[PDB]
JSON list of C-alpha atoms in Angstrom, two decimals:
[
{"chain": "X", "resi": 1, "resn": "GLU", "atom": "CA", "xyz": [-0.24, -0.09, -0.08]},
{"chain": "X", "resi": 2, "resn": "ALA", "atom": "CA", "xyz": [2.87, 2.81, 1.13]},
{"chain": "X", "resi": 3, "resn": "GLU", "atom": "CA", "xyz": [4.21, 2.27, -2.82]},
{"chain": "X", "resi": 4, "resn": "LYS", "atom": "CA", "xyz": [1.17, 3.09, -4.91]},
{"chain": "X", "resi": 5, "resn": "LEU", "atom": "CA", "xyz": [0.62, 6.22, -3.01]},
{"chain": "X", "resi": 6, "resn": "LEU", "atom": "CA", "xyz": [4.05, 7.32, -4.16]},
{"chain": "X", "resi": 7, "resn": "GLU", "atom": "CA", "xyz": [3.44, 6.06, -7.80]},
{"chain": "X", "resi": 8, "resn": "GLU", "atom": "CA", "xyz": [-0.13, 7.53, -7.46]},
{"chain": "X", "resi": 9, "resn": "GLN", "atom": "CA", "xyz": [1.64, 11.16, -6.05]},
{"chain": "X", "resi": 10, "resn": "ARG", "atom": "CA", "xyz": [4.39, 11.39, -8.74]},
{"chain": "X", "resi": 11, "resn": "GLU", "atom": "CA", "xyz": [2.40, 11.35, -11.97]},
{"chain": "X", "resi": 12, "resn": "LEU", "atom": "CA", "xyz": [-0.07, 13.48, -9.59]},
{"chain": "X", "resi": 13, "resn": "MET", "atom": "CA", "xyz": [2.92, 15.71, -9.15]},
{"chain": "X", "resi": 14, "resn": "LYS", "atom": "CA", "xyz": [4.61, 15.29, -12.31]},
{"chain": "X", "resi": 15, "resn": "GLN", "atom": "CA", "xyz": [0.73, 16.34, -14.09]},
{"chain": "X", "resi": 16, "resn": "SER", "atom": "CA", "xyz": [0.34, 19.18, -12.30]},
{"chain": "X", "resi": 17, "resn": "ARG", "atom": "CA", "xyz": [4.30, 20.43, -12.71]},
{"chain": "X", "resi": 18, "resn": "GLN", "atom": "CA", "xyz": [2.80, 21.10, -16.72]},
{"chain": "X", "resi": 19, "resn": "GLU", "atom": "CA", "xyz": [-0.75, 22.28, -15.48]},
{"chain": "X", "resi": 20, "resn": "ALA", "atom": "CA", "xyz": [1.76, 24.86, -13.62]},
{"chain": "X", "resi": 21, "resn": "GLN", "atom": "CA", "xyz": [4.07, 25.72, -16.98]},
{"chain": "X", "resi": 22, "resn": "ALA", "atom": "CA", "xyz": [0.79, 26.42, -18.30]},
{"chain": "X", "resi": 23, "resn": "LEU", "atom": "CA", "xyz": [-1.03, 28.67, -15.62]},
{"chain": "X", "resi": 24, "resn": "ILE", "atom": "CA", "xyz": [2.49, 30.34, -15.62]},
{"chain": "X", "resi": 25, "resn": "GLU", "atom": "CA", "xyz": [2.51, 30.99, -19.66]},
{"chain": "X", "resi": 26, "resn": "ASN", "atom": "CA", "xyz": [-1.06, 31.80, -19.60]},
{"chain": "X", "resi": 27, "resn": "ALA", "atom": "CA", "xyz": [-1.55, 34.58, -16.78]},
{"chain": "X", "resi": 28, "resn": "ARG", "atom": "CA", "xyz": [1.82, 36.12, -18.77]},
{"chain": "X", "resi": 29, "resn": "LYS", "atom": "CA", "xyz": [-0.03, 35.54, -22.33]},
{"chain": "X", "resi": 30, "resn": "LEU", "atom": "CA", "xyz": [-3.70, 37.54, -20.44]},
{"chain": "X", "resi": 31, "resn": "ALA", "atom": "CA", "xyz": [-0.47, 39.96, -19.20]},
{"chain": "X", "resi": 32, "resn": "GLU", "atom": "CA", "xyz": [0.55, 40.77, -22.70]},
{"chain": "X", "resi": 33, "resn": "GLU", "atom": "CA", "xyz": [-2.39, 40.85, -24.13]},
{"chain": "X", "resi": 34, "resn": "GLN", "atom": "CA", "xyz": [-3.78, 43.59, -21.59]},
{"chain": "X", "resi": 35, "resn": "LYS", "atom": "CA", "xyz": [-0.76, 45.51, -22.08]},
{"chain": "X", "resi": 36, "resn": "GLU", "atom": "CA", "xyz": [-1.59, 45.06, -25.25]},
{"chain": "X", "resi": 37, "resn": "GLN", "atom": "CA", "xyz": [-5.58, 46.31, -24.79]},
{"chain": "X", "resi": 38, "resn": "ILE", "atom": "CA", "xyz": [-3.89, 49.82, -23.45]},
{"chain": "X", "resi": 39, "resn": "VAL", "atom": "CA", "xyz": [-1.47, 50.44, -26.33]},
{"chain": "X", "resi": 40, "resn": "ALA", "atom": "CA", "xyz": [-4.35, 49.75, -29.11]},
{"chain": "X", "resi": 41, "resn": "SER", "atom": "CA", "xyz": [-6.29, 51.47, -27.18]},
{"chain": "X", "resi": 42, "resn": "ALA", "atom": "CA", "xyz": [-3.65, 54.37, -26.97]},
{"chain": "X", "resi": 43, "resn": "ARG", "atom": "CA", "xyz": [-3.03, 54.87, -30.55]},
{"chain": "X", "resi": 44, "resn": "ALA", "atom": "CA", "xyz": [-7.05, 55.06, -31.18]},
{"chain": "X", "resi": 45, "resn": "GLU", "atom": "CA", "xyz": [-6.65, 57.82, -28.47]},
{"chain": "X", "resi": 46, "resn": "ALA", "atom": "CA", "xyz": [-4.17, 59.59, -29.90]},
{"chain": "X", "resi": 47, "resn": "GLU", "atom": "CA", "xyz": [-5.81, 59.00, -33.51]},
{"chain": "X", "resi": 48, "resn": "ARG", "atom": "CA", "xyz": [-9.11, 60.75, -31.28]},
{"chain": "X", "resi": 49, "resn": "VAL", "atom": "CA", "xyz": [-7.20, 64.52, -29.95]},
{"chain": "X", "resi": 50, "resn": "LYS", "atom": "CA", "xyz": [-5.49, 64.97, -33.76]},
{"chain": "X", "resi": 51, "resn": "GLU", "atom": "CA", "xyz": [-9.26, 64.15, -35.73]},
{"chain": "X", "resi": 52, "resn": "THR", "atom": "CA", "xyz": [-11.41, 66.31, -33.01]},
{"chain": "X", "resi": 53, "resn": "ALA", "atom": "CA", "xyz": [-8.43, 68.86, -33.25]},
{"chain": "X", "resi": 54, "resn": "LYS", "atom": "CA", "xyz": [-8.38, 69.30, -36.59]},
{"chain": "X", "resi": 55, "resn": "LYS", "atom": "CA", "xyz": [-12.51, 68.86, -36.58]},
{"chain": "X", "resi": 56, "resn": "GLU", "atom": "CA", "xyz": [-12.13, 72.37, -34.81]}
]
């Protein structure tokens, strides 16, 4: 009985380590996308000021 626990636990650790990798990569990607939304938006804002100013 002790050994099985070890074998199931090691596999569960190994799977968890892949999940952890995935989590860190995915969470950074979300961050990266957020950094991008803020810049996409920023560019947009830069265009609006100029356009409104020309219209004026």
